[PDB]
Amino acid sequence: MDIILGIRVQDSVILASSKAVTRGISVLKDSDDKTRQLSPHTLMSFAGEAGDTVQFAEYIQANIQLYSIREDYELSPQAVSSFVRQELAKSIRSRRPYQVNVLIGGYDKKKNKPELYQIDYLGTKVELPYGAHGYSGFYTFSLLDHHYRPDMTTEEGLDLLKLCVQELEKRMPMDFKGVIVKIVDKDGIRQVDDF
Amino acid sequence: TTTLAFRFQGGIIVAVDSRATAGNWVASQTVKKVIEINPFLLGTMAGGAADCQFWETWLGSQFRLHELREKERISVAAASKILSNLVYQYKGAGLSMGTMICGYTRKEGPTIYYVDSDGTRLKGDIFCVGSGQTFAYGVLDSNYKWDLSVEDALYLGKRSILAAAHRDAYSGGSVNLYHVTEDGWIYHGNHDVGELFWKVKEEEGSFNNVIG
Amino acid sequence: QFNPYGDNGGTILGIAGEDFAVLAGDTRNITDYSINSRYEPKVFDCGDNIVMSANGFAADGDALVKRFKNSVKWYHFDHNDKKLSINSAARNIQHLLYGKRFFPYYVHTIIAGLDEDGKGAVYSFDPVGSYEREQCRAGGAAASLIMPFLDNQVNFKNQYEPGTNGKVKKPLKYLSVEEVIKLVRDSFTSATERHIQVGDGLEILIVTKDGVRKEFYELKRD
Amino acid sequence: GSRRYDSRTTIFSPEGRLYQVEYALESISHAGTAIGIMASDGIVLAAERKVTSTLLEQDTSTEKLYKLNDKIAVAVAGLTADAEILINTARIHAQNYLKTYNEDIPVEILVRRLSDIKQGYTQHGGLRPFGVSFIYAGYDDRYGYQLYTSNPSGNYTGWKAISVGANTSAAQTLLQMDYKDDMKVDDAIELALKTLSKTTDSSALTYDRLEFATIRKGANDGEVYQKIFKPQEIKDILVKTGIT
Amino acid sequence: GYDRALSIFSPDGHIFQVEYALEAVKRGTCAVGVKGKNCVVLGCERRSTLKLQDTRITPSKVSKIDSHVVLSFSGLNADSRILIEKARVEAQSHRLTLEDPVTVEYLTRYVAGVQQRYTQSGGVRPFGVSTLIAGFDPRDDEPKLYQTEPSGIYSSWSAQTIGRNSKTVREFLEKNYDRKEPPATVEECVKLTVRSLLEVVQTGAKNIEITVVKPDSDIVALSSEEINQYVTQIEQEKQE
Amino acid sequence: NNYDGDTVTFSPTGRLFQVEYALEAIKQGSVTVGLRSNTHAVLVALKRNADELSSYQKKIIKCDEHMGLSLAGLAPDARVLSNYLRQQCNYSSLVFNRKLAVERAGHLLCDKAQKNTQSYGGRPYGVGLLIIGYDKSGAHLLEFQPSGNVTELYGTAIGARSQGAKTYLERTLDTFIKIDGNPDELIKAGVEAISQSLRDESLTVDNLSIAIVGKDTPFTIYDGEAVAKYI
Amino acid sequence: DRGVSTFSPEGRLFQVEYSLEAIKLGSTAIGIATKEGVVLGVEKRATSPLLESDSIEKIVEIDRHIGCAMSGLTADARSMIEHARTAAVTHNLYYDEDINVESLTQSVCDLALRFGELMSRPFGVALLIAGHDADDGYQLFHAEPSGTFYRYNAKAIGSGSEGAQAELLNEWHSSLTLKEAELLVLKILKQVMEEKLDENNAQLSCITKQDGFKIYDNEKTAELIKELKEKEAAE
Amino acid sequence: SDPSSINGGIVVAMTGKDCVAIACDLRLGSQSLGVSNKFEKIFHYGHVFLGITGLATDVTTLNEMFRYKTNLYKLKEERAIEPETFTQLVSSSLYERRFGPYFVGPVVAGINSKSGKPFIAGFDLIGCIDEAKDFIVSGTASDQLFGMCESLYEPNLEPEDLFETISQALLNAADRDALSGWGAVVYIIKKDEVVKRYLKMRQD
Amino acid sequence: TQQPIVTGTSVISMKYDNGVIIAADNLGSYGSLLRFNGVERLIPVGDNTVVGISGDISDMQHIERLLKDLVTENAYDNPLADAEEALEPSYIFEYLATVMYQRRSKMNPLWNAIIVAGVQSNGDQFLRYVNLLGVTYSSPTLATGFGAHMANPLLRKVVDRESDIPKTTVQVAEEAIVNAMRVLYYRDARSSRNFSLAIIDKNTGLTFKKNLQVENMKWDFAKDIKGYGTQKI
Ligand SMILES: *[B]([O])([O])[C]([C][C]([C])[C])[N]C(=O)[C]([C]C1=[C][C]=[C][C]=[C]1)[N]C(=O)C1=[C]N=[C][C]=N1
Ligand SMILES: [Mg+2]
C-alpha cells in the first residue's frame, strides 16, 4: 500500500496510515485499516506488496500473542521490534522474500517511555522520534525537522500530524483517501475517529 | 470480464457477464462466472478461467469438510481466508484470479470479501472486478443506497453489467443475476445482452447515442 | 534452447442432439508446412459410451487420452464396474489438466456422449482445465472459421421470422442426426478451403443409446 | 531381529512409574550434595566435590558449578558428562533468545526449555534419560532472584532453599529449620556451609573438597555479579564462618 | 528412527501402556471442575509435603490456553507442559485461519486427538495425563466443561474430578450437584468446589487452589486469604 | 517353537514357521476351484457368509480384460496382491502396448511375496490365489502360495476340503481338457468339481460364484440369478 | 518380546485377534437395513450421572448419504472418520457425484492393516457403515480392524452382539417398514442393555434417499420408546 | 540496486604509540533519503572493537551474530577473545556464506591484553584479511579515506595526537561523499581505558 | 536442454503388399564437417523389426543400447522368446515413444527422429514415427528431416492411400526408395553416397543390405552451364 507515518511524543506514539487500496486503475476500497495490534501496548502499521503485507502482519501478530499466553507477560516494544527485524532479515535471503515495510509503535510499561521503531523489508531497524516509509518521508521529514519537539503533548503531536497530512494531500499525485490515526500510550491503544 | 457484488437492506446482489476471450477471439458467450459453492455461499470468477473454476470448486469441498467436522455453517470470513491463504502459497507461480466470496450468516450478516491472486483479501460493501470494472463502478456509485428494494437492487446490478458489456470489448454475452438473503441465494435468470440492450434503451430512455 | 511444445494442426467439432451426440475431426497431421500423415485418427472411443479428442500438440493429446482411458479402467476397478457418467468424466479430465497447471498439456479437449437423462451432451476444455457443458463447440486450428457458422445454423443467431422484421426470433427447433451430419460435412469442406492445416479426410463418431458408430468422408488433399 | 535386545527405555510400570527415570534418580542420590539458598539481596550456590585426591589440580577444576550466562548459573548432581551436553544446549538457547529479542533470557524460560528436552527422552526415541539433576540460580527483572531444580523426568519446581544429590532429606530438614524470609546473603553463605558440614560423609569439610558461588546485586549500582570462588577464597570463608 | 511399537493389544483385548498411563493419573494430585449457571470453577490440590517452596515462581496447576479457555490436569507434570504448549499453538493457529477463537469443544477435541495419536504411533508412549478443559465459547454465555484421558476419549461434564482420591470427591458431587438447579452464583459454585476438595485435601491452608472463569474472557485466581474465608465459613456451618 | 517369532528365523530343520503359519490361513478359507481347456479357462468359487443377515464375501477379482483370480485366506492381502497385478498388467499395456503374459504375472507375484519372507519387521502374505488368463499362448491356470511358489496347472483347488475337488479333476483330466468351444460344458465340469468339496451345505443362487475367460471371451464374473442355470 | 505383525500357528494375526476382544468390551451398536431406509442405533453408556450424556457421540455423519456407528475404543475411530469424510468429499471433487457406500467402506478398511515396526497397532474399534446410492440402494456394512467388511441386512456389534444377532435372525424380513425397523432397534437395545433404556442413554438415527442422514432428537426417540411400550403390552 | 551503497557509511581505524583508534559516521539512508543520524557502526565485544559498513540489515545481523559467538567463546574459554583470534573468527564466518554473502566491510581494532601490541585489520565481504600496520578504511568513501590517511598519517602518534589525525581523516572524507556524514564518533583505545568522543560536523 | 553435436540426416520408408522397406545413409556429420563416414543408422531388433534413427548420434547409441537391453530382458523367464512371446514392432515402438515423451517432459530430450518399420505376428505391416517431442504418427510412407520434404512426395506417387498398398510389389517399392536416396544425395548438403537398406517381408523375412551406393547419376548436362546469366565462355 502507500503512506504510513509515525511520531513519538512525550507520553505516547501516534501512527497514521492511509485508507486507500488501489489495484491498477480503480480504488477498490477507501476505508482500509493498515495496522494490527500485536499486544495491548504495541501496534504495527505496514505497507508493501499486495497480499504479503497482511500475511506478514498477522503472522507476527499470531507469534506475539502466542508468547503473551505462554509467559503471561507482554514483551517490550524493543523486544518485539527485534523479533520482527530478524524475521525480515531471515526473509530477504529466502526463495520468495516478504516485500513488507513496517512501523512499530509501543509504550514500554517498565520504563514509562513511548518508543517508535522503523523497519524496512531488508530487516533494517532504527529507533526514531518520527519516521515514515515510501515516498511519505520525502515530504514530511522537513516539517518534522522544524516543528517536532521531544516534549510535545499528544494534542500537539496530532496538530503536527495534521500539518503533515495536509502537505501530502497538496503535493502527492496519488489520492490516498485520507488516513486512520491511532494513539499508543500507558492506557493502551485507541483510534481517533474524526480526522 | 465484469463482475460486481454489493451489500444492501435486502442482503447482497451479485451480477456477472458471460464472455470469455483468447486475444481478440470470442471463445465463449455462455460462461457461468458465478460458482454455487453451497446454498448460502457464492463465488465470482475473473481472470484465468481454469484457476478460478478449479480452486473455487475445490473451495466448496473444504467448506463441506468444515461443516462435517464442526457441525456448523462456515463463516464468510473463514471461507474467504481459506482461498486467500491457498493462493498465497502459489504466489509468484503465475496464478491469475480476481474473486468475490459472498454469503450471509447469523453472526456476520451479509458479507462480501474481495480475494485476489496477489494474496489481497478485503472486506467491503461494494466491489467490481474485471476488465470492465470501471464502467460498472460508474453506474453503481451514482445510484447506490442502503435502502433499496430487492426489485430495484436487482435491476441496478443488471444495468451496471449492461453498461460494461457495451463499452468493454472483453465483456458481454449475457447477465447472470443472484440475490443472497437470510435464507440463502436465489437465481434470477440469464439475460441475453442482445435483447436486454434494446429493451433497456426503449424503456429507460438511455443510450441515446446509439441508433435503434 | 530446447522447445518442448509443437503444433500438429488439425481441427475438431462436437455437436449435441436431442437424443444423440457427434464428435468429428479431420485426419490430417502436420508440422510447419509438411504433412506427416493423411490418415492419423484423432477422435477416440474411450468406453462407457464416451468419445474424446485432444487437439493441438499431438504428443500431449495422445498422453492425455491415454491417461483418461486409464482413468476409466480404474474407475471400473474401484467402484464395482459403475458406468462413468459424462459429467463425471468431465470433472475427472479437469483434474488431469490442472494437475499440469505449471507445465500444461498444450491441447484443446472436447468430449461427447449422453447425459444420465439420455439427452445429448458435449463438454469443452481449455489447456489448463477450465470446462463447461455446451450444445455446440469447434476446437483447434480452424475453430475460428467454424464456430460462427454454428452460431448461425445450429442456434439460429441473428435470424428472425419473415414479415415481423426483427420482432419475432426464429424458433429453436431440434435437429436430427441426418441434419447434423450435413452441417458437420459442410463445416469441414468450408474449413478445408481456407485453412492449410485442414484436409485429407473427415472422421465422425456418432453416439446414441445403441452405442458408438463411425462414418468417414474424403476431404481435399492439397 | 533387533527387537530381542531392546530395553524399552520409555515405558510405564504397572504402578504408572517410568522405570528409567526412577533408576536415574537412584543414581543421582549417590552424587555429591549441592545446595542453593535464595536471599533478599542475592543467591548462594554451594556444592561438595566427590572424594578428591591431593594430586588433583583444584584451581583449574570444575565438576559442580557451571556458568550458563552472566545472569544464570547451575549446580550439577549426577553424571558430569551428561550435564555438559545439556549445559551447552542451555548456553545456546540463552544466546538464541538474546539474538531474537535483544534481551537476556528470563530464568524460567531457560529452565522450561532444558526440562522439556529431558521430558522428550522419557516419552520417545528409545534412548536412556540424562542422569542429571540441576539447581538453577539466576536473576531477571521480572521475578528478581530465583532458584529452580529439574530432574531426569523433566519436571521442574521453584524454591527458596533446596538441595540435590546425596543426603537431601537430612539437608532439607536443616535448611527448613534455620531459613527465614528476611535473610541476607552473608547469612545464607553461613547456612549453606553449616548444612554441608553436617550432612557430609567425609570426616571434615575443607577448602579442597568444595565449590562455591554467589549471585549478588553487590555490584556497583543496579546490576548483577557472578562470583565463582577460588580455592584460597573458599579457605578464607571457612575460617570466617568458623568451620576450620 | 526409533519405531518400536510400545502400545499394543494383549490377549484379553487391553492396551496395557494406555492403562498404566491412567495409573500415573491416579497418582497425581486431585483436580476438580464444577460449572454453575453463569460460571465454571476449577479446583486443584497442592500436596504439603513440599514446604520451603517459592509460590511466586513455582508452576501453577491451572494454565490459560487462550484468554477464554483454561486447562488443569492430573498426572505427570512434565507431560502436561507438552500438551499445554501444543494446545496454545493450535489456539493461535485457529484464530489466524478461521478469524475466531476456538470453541471449548474444539480445543478439547484437538488435545484428545494428540493423546490418541500417542497410543498408536511407533517409538512413543502415551501421555500420563488426564485434563479438565473449561471456558466459554466466543459470544456465548453457556458454561463448558470437558474431560480428556490418555486413551484419547473425551466428553462433557456438569461436574467432574480426576487424580488421587477422585473416587471420593466424585461421590460427593454426585449427591450434592443438582442438574435442574446448578450453583446460581459465583459464591455458591466456589463454595461447592472447596467443599468437595475438603473431603480429600487435609488442611485448608495453602493446599487448595481455586480459579474462577466467567464469560467474555473474565478469568481470575483466588488468593490464600480469600480461599481461607470459604474454609472458615464451611466448617462453622458444619459444627451443628 | 523358539524359531517362529518372526520371518527372519530358520528352524533347526531349515523351516520357516511364519511362512507355514501363513499357509495355514489358506486352509481355513472357503473352497475355490480352477480348471481350463485349450479355448477357455474357468474359476468356480464357494462364497462364505457370516450369518443369514449377512452377504456372501466376494472371492473373485478381475485384474485385466484377459486375466483375473480367485482368493482363499486373508481378503485384504488378496486386495493388495490383485492391486499389484492390476498395476503390472497396466504398466505392460501403457509402456509396451502388450498384454501381460500369465506366466510372467506369476513370476512377479512370486518375487513380491518373497521379499516379505527374508526381511525383518514385515510379514508373509496370508492368502492363496488361483490366476486364470488367456494370452498369446492360449489358456492358462496358475496357483499362488504366499511362500512365493507359483505353479502352472491344467486344474486345481485351494481352501478347506479342496482335496476332494482336486482328485475329481485328476480323474477327469482327459475329458475336460478336450472341452473346446463349449463354455457351458466347461463350467458344468467346474461346478461338478467344486461339488466334491461340499458338506451339509449345497450350491444356492447367492452362494455360488463363477468366472470365465477364453478365445473370444473377456474376463467376466457371474453371480446371482446368472448362475441359477448351473445349479 | 515378539513381532506386531506376527502370525499365530492357526494362521491368524495375533494383534488383529486381540483388537477384536477390545471390541467385545465396547457398548452395543445395532443396524437394520430396509427398502424404505437404514436405521442405526447405539448404547451411550455414561460412566457417571454427572457426565452430560448428549456429548457422547457414537453415531457420526460421514456424508449426506452415509452414516456411521461405532463400538470399542471409540477414540481410535476419530482418524477413521476423518479419513472417511475426506475420501467421500475428495471423490465428489474428482468425479462430481456421490461415492458408493461399498467404495467408501473399502477405503476405510485399507487403513486397517497399515500397522508394523505406519501406525504401531491395529484399530481397537468396529464400525457399522450405513448409506444409500443409486446403483445398489440402501446398504449396511460392518467394517473390522482385520480389513474385512461384510454387507448385512441387519447387524449388531459390541458387548450384547451375539444375543442381539440371534434376535435379528428371527425378526428381519424383506418387507420391513422404516417405522417397524426403528422400534425393532429400540426393542433389541432395551433387551441387551444393563441400565433401563430411555432417550438419554440410547440414540437413534437413520438414512433415507429423500432426507439423507439424520440423528434423531431426544424428544422424537422418547415417543418411539412410548410407542414400543404400548405395543408390547397389547398382547 | 547495488547492496553495498544503498544505506551508505564509513569506518576508519589507525594505530599509534601503545594505542589504537577506530571511528565511524552516523548516517543511515535509503539512497538519497536520509533516514537516521544515530546509526552507530562500531560495536565491541570485551576489549575487541568491530566496525561494520555496508548494507545495514547485515551490519545489525552480523553484530548480533558476533555477540552470540563471542559470548559462547567466553563461557567455554573462560577468557575474553583477543583481536588476532576474533579477526580469524570474522573471516571464517564470512567465507561460509561464499556464494550468498553478507554485503559488508568489517574492520577490527584492539590491543592484545597479554602482549600489549596494538592491532588493526580489515576484510572484504567474503572474508579476506587485510592486516595493515598503519591504517584500515571501509565504506562508500573508502577512496577518500585512503587519500586522507595516506597523507595525514605518521607512525608512533600519542593517543591525544592520534585523535586529531583520525578525526580529520574521517570528517574531510565524509564531506566528499553524499551517502556519508550526519555525525561521527571516535574511539581512542589504550590498554586499560577507552574514551569515546562525538564530533561536531556539517549536517548535510 | 542440450544441442545436438554429431548428427545423422534423413531416414526414409514405405509399405508394400507383403511388408515394409526402410533406408538411411551412413554419415555422421559434425556441423558442416562430414566427420564420420561409416555410421550404421538402421538397427534391427529380432528378425521382424528395424529401427531407423536420425539426429544426435550419441543419443542414437544410447537408444541402440536400450533396444539391445530390451531383447535381453524379454528373453528372461520366457520359453516362447523366439516364438509367440517374441518382441513385436508395436511393442518396440510404444516403448521408445514412452521414453521420448518422458524425456521431453523432463526438459532433457533425446534429440532424435525415429521410424520403426516391421511386420506383426498376423502379417500386418507396421510403420510408425516418433521424435524428440514424443509426437507420433503413421502413414503408408514416412520420412524424417529432408526426406519428409523430398522423399515423401516421390513415395506418395507409388502409394497415395491405403488401397494402393496391395497393388504395390516389392520390386516397385525398392526402386522408389533407391531413387529417393539418389535425389537426397543431389539436394541434401549433409548426406552421403553410401547407405543401408532393409526389407521386412511377411514371407521372406528380414533382408539387410549394407554398403549400397547411389548410382546412375545425371551430371553430364553440367558442362553446358556457364556463368550466372550473361557470360558465354
Ligand atoms: B474475464 O475477462 O476476466 C474472463 C473471465 C473468465 C473466468 C472467463 N477471462 C477471460 O476471458 C480470459 C482472458 C482474459 C481477458 C481479459 C482479462 C483477463 C483474461 N480467458 C480465459 O481464461 C480463457 C479460458 N479458456 C479459453 C479462452 N480464454
Ligand atoms: Mg486444406
Q: Where in the sequence is the domain holding H179, given as residue range(s)?
A: 1-204
CB contact under 8 A, I136 and C8: no
SS3 F4: coil
Q: Report the alpha-carbon distance of residue E143 to residue E158 in Å, rounded.
A: 9
Helix, strand, coil content of chain D in percent (nearest 5): 40, 25, 35
Selection from G10, G25, G42, G30 nearest residue G203 by Cα: G42
Q: Which three cell numbers stand for residue C185?
A: 460435412
Please give the method by which this entry was determined.
Answer: X-ray
| CATH architecture for residues D1-244 | 4-Layer Sandwich (3.60)
How many domains does chain I contain in total?
1
Backbone angles phi and psi of D209, in degrees to 5: -110, 15
Selection from I208, I144, I209 nearest residue I180 by Cα: I144
A126 touches chain E (CB under 8 A): no
Q: Report the alpha-carbon distance of residue I149 to residue I132 in Å, rounded.
A: 19
Q: Are A28 and B99 in contact (CB under 8 A)?
A: no
Q: Are A47 and A53 in contact (CB under 8 A)?
A: yes
Instruction: State in Å, rounded, how far the first CA of chain H is from the last one.
Output: 23
Q: Report the alpha-carbon distance of residue F196 to residue E122 in Å, rounded.
A: 48
Q: Are C82 and C48 in contact (CB under 8 A)?
A: no
Q: Are D13 and D19 in contact (CB under 8 A)?
A: yes
For cell 450471509, the residue is B104
Q: Report the alpha-carbon distance of residue F183 to residue E168 in Å, rounded.
A: 77
SS3 B94: coil
Q: Which residues contact G81 (CB under 8 A, 6 or more apart)?
A: G60, G62, G68
Tell whether the torsion through CA atoms of G134, G139, G144 and G148 is positive or negative: negative
Buried b / exposed e over D91-126, threshold 16 CB at 10 Å, is bebbbebbbbbbebbbbbebbbbbbbbbbebbbbeb
Selection from D103, A145, A121, A47 nearest residue H56 by Cα: A121
Ligand nearest to the CA of B1: 1
Count helices and strands in chain I by DSSP H and E runs: 4, 13
Selection from C150, C156, C155 nearest residue C191 by Cα: C150
- F228, exposed or middle or buried, with CB in 10 Å at 0-12, 13-18, 19+? exposed
Selection from C207, C210, C194 nearest residue C24 by Cα: C207
Q: Amino acid identity, residue B120?
A: T
Please determine, looking at this structure, whether the domain spanning C1-222 carries the CATH number 3.60.20.10: yes
Domain ranges in chain C? 1-222
- Taking residue H192's Cβ as centre, other Cβ atoms within 10 Å add up to 7
CB under 5 Å of ion ligand 2: residues: C 192, 199
Q: Where in the sequence is the domain holding I70, given as residue range(s)?
A: 1-233
Q: How far is the CA of C194 from the centre of ligand 2 (A)?
A: 7
Q: Report the alpha-carbon distance of residue H146 to residue H151 in Å, rounded.
A: 9
Q: Which three cell numbers stand for residue D58?
A: 583444584
Q: Which three cell numbers stand for residue I87?
A: 518382441
The CATH number given to whatever domain includes residue H130 is 3.60.20.10
Q: Report the alpha-carbon distance of residue H90 to residue H113 in Å, rounded.
A: 19
Rounded to the nearest 10 degrees, how much is the dihedral formed by the CA atoms of G222, G224, G225, G228? 160
Q: Where in the sequence is the domain holding F15, given as residue range(s)?
A: 1-231
A73: chain E residues, CB-CB within 8 Å: none
Q: Amino acid identity, residue G203?
A: Q
Question: Sheet of A13-18: strands edge to edge?
Answer: A130-133, A4-8, A13-18, A179-185, A188-192
Q: Report the alpha-carbon distance of residue I211 to residue E124 in Å, rounded.
A: 74
Strand partners, A116: A105
F92: left (phi over 0), alpha (psi -120 to 50) or beta: alpha
Q: Which three cell numbers stand for residue C142?
A: 480452424
SS3 D113: helix
Q: Are A177 and A154 in contact (CB under 8 A)?
A: no
Ligand nearest to the CA of C126: 1
I151-160's contacts with Cβ under 8 Å and 24+ in sequence apart are I151/I10, I151/I12, I151/I180, I151/I183, I151/I184, I152/C34, I152/C35, I154/I179, I154/I180, I154/I183, I155/I12, I155/I14, I155/I180, I158/I14, I159/I14, I159/I15, I159/I16
Q: Amino acid identity, residue D237?
A: I
Rounded to the nearest 10 degrees, how much is the dihedral formed by the CA atoms of B170, B176, B179, B180? -70
G82: chain B residues, CB-CB within 8 Å: 69
Rounded to the nearest 10 degrees, how much is the dihedral formed by the CA atoms of F184, F189, F194, F195? 100
B211 touches chain C (CB under 8 A): no
Q: Which three cell numbers stand for residue C63?
A: 498422453
SS3 E67: coil
Q: Are G81 and G88 in contact (CB under 8 A)?
A: no
- Give the helix ranges, DSSP H, for I15-88: 57-75
Half-sphere exposure of E2 (CA within 13 A, CB side): 17
Half-sphere exposure of H15 (CA within 13 A, CB side): 19
Structural domains for chain E: 1-240 (3.60.20.10)
Count helices and strands in chain H by DSSP H and E runs: 4, 12
Q: Which CATH code for domain G1-235?
A: 3.60.20.10
- Taking residue A143's Cβ as centre, other Cβ atoms within 10 Å add up to 16
Selection from B13, B30, B46 nearest residue B177 by Cα: B13
Question: Sheet of D34-39: strands edge to edge?
Answer: D161-164, D34-39, D42-48, D210-216, D225-228
Pairing of strands F127-135, F138-144: antiparallel
Q: Amino acid identity, residue B132?
A: G
Q: At what angle do helices D80-101 and D107-123 cross, to 10 degrees?
A: 130
Selection from I124, I93, I87 nearest residue I202 by Cα: I124
Q: Report the alpha-carbon distance of residue I198 to residue I209 in Å, rounded.
A: 6
Q: Which three cell numbers stand for residue D67?
A: 556458568
Q: Kindly report the nearest CA distance between residue D222 and chain A, in angstroms.
A: 15
Q: Are D212 and D45 in contact (CB under 8 A)?
A: yes
Selection from G113, G7, C84, C81 nearest residue F60 by Cα: C81
Q: What is the DSSP letter of C50?
A: -
> Is I9 tagged catalytic?
no
Half-sphere exposure of B148 (CA within 13 A, CB side): 20
Instruction: State in Å, rounded, how far the first CA of chain C is from the last one.
Output: 33
Q: What is the DSSP string of E139-208?
A: T--SEEEEEE-TT--EEEBSEEEESTTHHHHHHHHHHH--SSS---SHHHHHHHHHHHHHTT-S-SSTTE
Q: Report the alpha-carbon distance of residue B64 to residue B54 in Å, rounded.
A: 16
- Tell me whether residue B49 is annotated as binding: yes
For chain F, the farthest-separated pair of C-alpha atoms sits apart, in whole angstroms, at 55
Q: At what angle do helices B133-143 and B150-167 cross, to 10 degrees?
A: 150
Q: Report the alpha-carbon distance of residue D154 to residue D17 in Å, rounded.
A: 14
Buried b / exposed e over F12-43, threshold 16 CB at 10 Å, is eeeebbbbbbbbbbbbebbbbbbbbbebbbbb
Q: Amino acid identity, residue F129?
A: L
Mutant choice from A95, A122, A125, A139 vs H, greatest count of H C-beta within 10 A = A122
Ligand nearest to the CA of C139: 1
Selection from G32, G59, G39 nearest residue G152 by Cα: G32
Q: Which residues contact G105 (CB under 8 A, 6 or more apart)?
A: G129, G141, G143, G149
Q: Report the alpha-carbon distance of residue C63 to residue F94 in Å, rounded.
A: 10
- Give the helix ranges, DSSP H, for G128-172: 161-171
Selection from H41, H36, H33, H45 nearest residue H13 by Cα: H41
CB contact under 8 A, A82 and D102: yes
Buried b / exposed e over E167-188, threshold 16 CB at 10 Å, is eebbebbeeebeeeebbeebeb
Q: Which three cell numbers stand for residue D23?
A: 533408576
Resolution value, angstrom units: 2.9
Q: Are H180 and H169 in contact (CB under 8 A)?
A: no
Structural domains for chain B: 1-212 (3.60.20.10)
Q: Are D115 and D155 in contact (CB under 8 A)?
A: yes
Q: Which residues contact C23 (CB under 8 A, 6 or more apart)?
A: C12, C13, C14, C43, C51, C52, C53, C110, C111, C112, C122, C204, C205, C207
Q: Report the alpha-carbon distance of residue G44 to residue G55 in Å, rounded.
A: 10
Q: Report the alpha-carbon distance of residue D135 to residue E54 in Å, rounded.
A: 14
Selection from F57, F50, F206, F58 nearest residue G162 by Cα: F50
CB contact under 8 A, B119 and A50: yes
Pocket lining for ligand 1, CB < 6 angstroms: B 1, 20-22, 27, 31, 33, 45-49, 52, 130-131, 170; C 126, 130
- Three-state helix/strand/coil letters over H104-153: EEEEEEEECCCCCCEEEEEECCCCCEECCCCEEEEECCHHHHHHHHHHHC
B30 touches chain C (CB under 8 A): yes
Q: Kindly report the nearest CA distance between residue A58 and chain E, in angstroms.
A: 7
Q: Which three cell numbers stand for residue G175?
A: 418387507
Structural domains for chain A: 1-195 (3.60.20.10)
Give the angle subtended at the CA of E5 by the CAs of E4 and E6, to the nearest 5°: 105
Residue count (chain A): 195
Q: Are H196 and H187 in contact (CB under 8 A)?
A: yes
Q: Which three cell numbers stand for residue B168?
A: 468493454
Q: Report the alpha-carbon distance of residue B55 to residue B84 in Å, rounded.
A: 11
Residue of C nearest to G100 (CA): C79
Q: Which three cell numbers stand for residue A61?
A: 501478530
- Give the helix ranges, DSSP H, for chain D: 19-28, 80-101, 107-123, 168-178, 185-199, 231-240
Tell whether the torsion through CA atoms of E162, E163, E169 and E174 is positive or negative: positive
Q: Which three cell numbers stand for residue B50?
A: 481454469
Q: Are C154 and C21 in contact (CB under 8 A)?
A: no
Helix, strand, coil content of chain F in percent (nearest 5): 40, 25, 35
CB nearest to I135's CB, from C2, C38, C59? C59
- Taking residue C177's Cβ as centre, other Cβ atoms within 10 Å add up to 18
Q: Which three cell numbers stand for residue F12?
A: 533347526
Q: Which three cell numbers stand for residue G211?
A: 432426507
Q: Report the alpha-carbon distance of residue D92 to residue D112 in Å, rounded.
A: 14
- Give the helix ranges, DSSP H, for chain I: 57-75, 89-105, 146-156, 170-187
* CA dist list (Å): I46 to C66, D208, I203: 28, 92, 16
Q: Report the alpha-carbon distance of residue I191 to residue I188 in Å, rounded.
A: 6
- Give the helix ranges, DSSP H, for E42-165: 77-98, 104-117
Q: How far is the CA of I163 from the centre of ligand 2 (A)?
A: 22
For cell 566435590, the residue is D49
Q: Are D206 and D31 in contact (CB under 8 A)?
A: no
Tell whether the torsion through CA atoms of G103, G109, G115 and G121 is positive or negative: positive
Q: What is the DSSP string of G23-86?
A: HHHSPPEEEEE-SS-EEEEEE---SSTTB-GGG---EEEEETTEEEEEEESGGGHHHHHHHHHH
Q: Report the alpha-carbon distance of residue G111 to residue H121 in Å, rounded.
A: 65
- B16, exposed or middle or buried, with CB in 10 Å at 0-12, 13-18, 19+? buried
Q: Report the alpha-carbon distance of residue D71 to residue D138 in Å, rounded.
A: 6
- Three-state helix/strand/coil letters over B99-165: EEEEEEECCCEEEEEEEECCCCEEECCEEEECCCHHHHHHHHHHHCCCCCCHHHHHHHHHHHHHHHH
Instruction: State in Å, rounded, how far the first CA of chain B is from the last one.
Output: 26
SS3 D164: strand
Q: Are G91 and G99 in contact (CB under 8 A)?
A: yes
Nearest atom in ligand 1 to B48's CA: 22
Q: Amino acid identity, residue E157?
A: W
Q: How far is the CA of C196 from the centre of ligand 2 (A)?
A: 4
